[PDB]
Amino acid sequence: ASPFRLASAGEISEVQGILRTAGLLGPEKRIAYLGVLDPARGAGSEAEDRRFRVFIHDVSGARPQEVTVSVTNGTVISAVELDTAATGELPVLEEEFEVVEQLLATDERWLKALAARNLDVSKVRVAPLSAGVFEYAEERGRRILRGLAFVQDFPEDSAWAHPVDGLVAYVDVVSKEVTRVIDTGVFPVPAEHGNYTDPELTGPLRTTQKPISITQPEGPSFTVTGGNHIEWEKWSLDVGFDVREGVVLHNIAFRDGDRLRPIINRASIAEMVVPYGDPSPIRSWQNYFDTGEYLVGQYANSLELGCDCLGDITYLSPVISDAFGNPREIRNGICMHEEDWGILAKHSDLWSGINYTRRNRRMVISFFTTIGNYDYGFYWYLYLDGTIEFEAKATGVVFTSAFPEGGSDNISQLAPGLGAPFHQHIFSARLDMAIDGFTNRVEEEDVVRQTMGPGNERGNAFSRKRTVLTRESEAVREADARTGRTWIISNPESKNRLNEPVGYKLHAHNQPTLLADPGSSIARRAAFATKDLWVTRYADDERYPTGDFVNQHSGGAGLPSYIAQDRDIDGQDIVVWHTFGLTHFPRVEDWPIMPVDTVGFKLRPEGFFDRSPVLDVPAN
Amino acid sequence: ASPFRLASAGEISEVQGILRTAGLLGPEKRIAYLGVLDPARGAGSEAEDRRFRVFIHDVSGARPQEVTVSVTNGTVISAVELDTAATGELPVLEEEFEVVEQLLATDERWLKALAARNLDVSKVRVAPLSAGVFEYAEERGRRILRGLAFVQDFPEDSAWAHPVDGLVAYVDVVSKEVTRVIDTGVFPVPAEHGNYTDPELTGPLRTTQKPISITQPEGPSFTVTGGNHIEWEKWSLDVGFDVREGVVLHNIAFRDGDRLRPIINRASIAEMVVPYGDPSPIRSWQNYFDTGEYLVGQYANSLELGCDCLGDITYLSPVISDAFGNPREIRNGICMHEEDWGILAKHSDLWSGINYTRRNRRMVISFFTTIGNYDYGFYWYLYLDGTIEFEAKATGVVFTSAFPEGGSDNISQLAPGLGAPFHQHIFSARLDMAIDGFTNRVEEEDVVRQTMGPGNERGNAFSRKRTVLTRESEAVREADARTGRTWIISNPESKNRLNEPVGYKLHAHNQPTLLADPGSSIARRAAFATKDLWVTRYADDERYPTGDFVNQHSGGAGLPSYIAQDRDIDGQDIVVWHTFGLTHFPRVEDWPIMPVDTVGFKLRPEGFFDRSPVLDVPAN
């Protein structure tokens, strides 16, 4: 009965039937995106209307369409033809992954390039890479993918160990034309394999690890109702899943005695981008938006008990649409479990003689996705003490190149002849805030140093200052680790027992933001990534920091266009967008498969409660 | 047989007998510090000489002494009388904690101050606080403690809830004189209690938490030999314990196939300081060095199975000396265990069809200490992939004051009338480095942004630069989070298979350093805390960043004096000193007992190995 329930297979089947009866899903059509729409503001009408948004691609070259459908009423609500040269191309389809390699295999220019390198075309894998927007006028309004080649010596071989450098091709996947083949010179193909399950590379496996058994003899402490509603240790929330964003958290709230207190209305990773910093023309165009161009949700892994998720695991299996509108279940795509998290609070008092120890724990909601060479784990954590944390875990195989004779300022060497270009992994968290309700504001908090002098005679004093962000034009903020800069989201109309506004403090990791030159194509298309924090006024259609159609969009969509409205954000329904990321100079230890590295952020209560919220935790 | 073995009760008893026979331990003497000395450089002689350093205090006013003793030979090696006005006072003795309150209870000025506030002297607890060095000429060369008062309504009451503001006293604990009583005015004593085990404050305890069982059916994967030698998943190290520093790690090394490769010779937290930022004369002198003035090791807690340490725990029980030279065991003072640590590496490959998942784990070595209101957990972590991490966990009860009518720029309000002054918790990690041996160097690594132009036509390139620190005068470094600044410790004479020097990269949290004015007393006494990174040339007597005798030392001892030697550190036996800390603006949620907050650092291999070091981890 909840409007935030997961999409069912039955809903997706009805969407397919509605689209087909309306004449919108003929044999040349493909569904490139399908997702449920959140309830509009003011859902207290109980009048549920389950609506779905669909992007429909046409493989014959007709204009694609954006369609909204009501499963509740069985009707098409709206259908709009898209001009893709204006508003952007549709996301990459899974079925286009193979098309690039197949089209190149019959192109005479591609074959001559492989012939010169004595490479058998049957052994050459071609990565299907998003194209961006650069200097090529013929690409405007065409659906382009770019290909980079890797050799597979045999079917189980890791192709990433054998990049074919000096060669790139561009393909129009709708007209099935190879537009350009660029060959800048022969590089030796690196010869060592990267097969991390080969005994000659691993050596004998360790026999020294003894098992760790994690069990819950009485079952977990959380309950799941209505398919995706979680209650755990005073937390309450709904776990959503969207094929673009992946796991989405709705209605995060905390039961403080009598009252269910909202904190966050919607939390998601709304974009991620991996820009490459190698100036070679073979790769200088390379920036993939895994979320906006490829859709990370559709590549979620099925997670195995004991391997991917350890302990007493409750799974969700979300349903998505395939390219023809058939429902497809992602079995065991989301793991949920609680974890011991060490000491929560501890004190032994010299005067009262009381010794006190309590243990912490956290609720984990996670999924893993794989897009080509890269794999990412997305983890949301809820802690007993009111802290909310996100963590991204990056692993997989690094993207490789040749390592040039005489070195490089922009590529790491991993093995003889084998390089890995410098790059970043940058995420955007979209936090639709609801601290004790929807009237919120953001303050920037800096440490203040004070000079020795009158009123500070011993030169020991220090303080803090808070600046309220009142309009969108002043709400684009940068980190400052040296001044301990954080941001507080508060509700000016809801006070704690000390008559102070209740709030939550955002703690960033303060990692570098986008390094590209501000005049670059990627700086225009990924403008969100150039600043640490943005605040906007809530609006239904402002969903992604990069706009709705990221693929081959020429730039400036999303957050820079939103904030130009310069709306009031001082005690209003607001959205925080936090940019955070890893800058990756690959190391030898990242090869041939990379140990996990992590980045994230957290929010801690700041006068939200009237005292510690974990006084009622028992003594184990 | 190992020279790095823990001190035994028998060794401490022999030290006591040697001191007493030499005439150095009469009834007026107290041992203020006693610890084993590490082997000098070049221990390949097998000629073990267990030597102990002792600080001896004299309660009658005679000059204290520093003594070195050989238990191996049963002799006093050296005994030096100390001029404490010159070189500093000895650490605070546990038996002086009560002396401040007792001396004040008979002082007519103190009693009149309590009388005006209608406080029964039998209910007033006085915190024994280190004095620092300020404007009071009569304190030079005297052993001074300062007292701040708190009311206990009954014996099990939390006195911290009832600070007596506006009142402070200074006491000479050797002459037993109250030198000054300062009363700046009557503040109401905050009335609410802070008793976190009182059912009227906690409410009914939660019944919702179900148990988490962590067991190892075949026992742990690590072995302990020789009392304190650990081998775990190719790591090898010795766990030491010192009454000043606490847990110390020696001889950290990694078994890389054939070779045992050193990484860190000695790792410790060599100082910590808590400076207060309240300019009131009642507290503006307040800065306690928990390590150097109080000795955190002697207040280590006995850790309870299931409460403090959960899982399959192996304990060490270190032995220390009491004030008379009797051995005293700290039962279960150190916990050691391994923990599951999520996903180590994962990849599902679209071209080979191979799905691969491995799990991570870490070895934990920890202890907890309590000094007055504050409690700290010190955690060292070793990971499968070669990462070394330190984490400090801060909890306990915040130090309180009155909250003034009309507010404060330097104090947080926690409850009606109850304040908590702003302060920092700043640590110094001393890392005696030995990356593949003792010829090491430090490089500072910054991200380099590049401008769009020739050779970077698309404006996407970025790079990195490394600066070698060659002499101590240029090795005092500051963080720069915006440029992704890290520091690499490498061995220029030991190369990986790519002919690059092997190294480890230090990742800091980039939190603010000391906020006090650079002309303050605390900036002079805690100079280490004003910069993020220092590198020195190794020397036997350069042990602490603040010098040997921190208590009432007038300033400039330790690191600023060491680096003035301007020694060569480019491919030499070097020591890295890393400053890191928390800046604490107390929140309501920190009261009446504070949930843990954390800070730390980590070191990751940087071309130390020839490829990923965890290819031989099996599949669970």
Ligand SMILES: O=CCc1ccccc1
């Ligand atoms: O992550 C998206 C870029 C990509 C897609 C498919 C193969 C390799 C790389």
Ligand SMILES: O=CCc1ccccc1
């Ligand atoms: O942490 C050292 C300062 C201190 C010592 C004893 C009681 C309260 C505070």
Ligand SMILES: [Cu+2]
């Ligand atoms: Cu990377």
Ligand SMILES: [Cu+2]
């Ligand atoms: Cu604190």
Ligand code: NA
């Ligand atoms: Na356009």
Ligand code: NA
């Ligand atoms: Na909002």
Ligand code: NA
């Ligand atoms: Na002096």
Ligand code: NA
């Ligand atoms: Na060294």
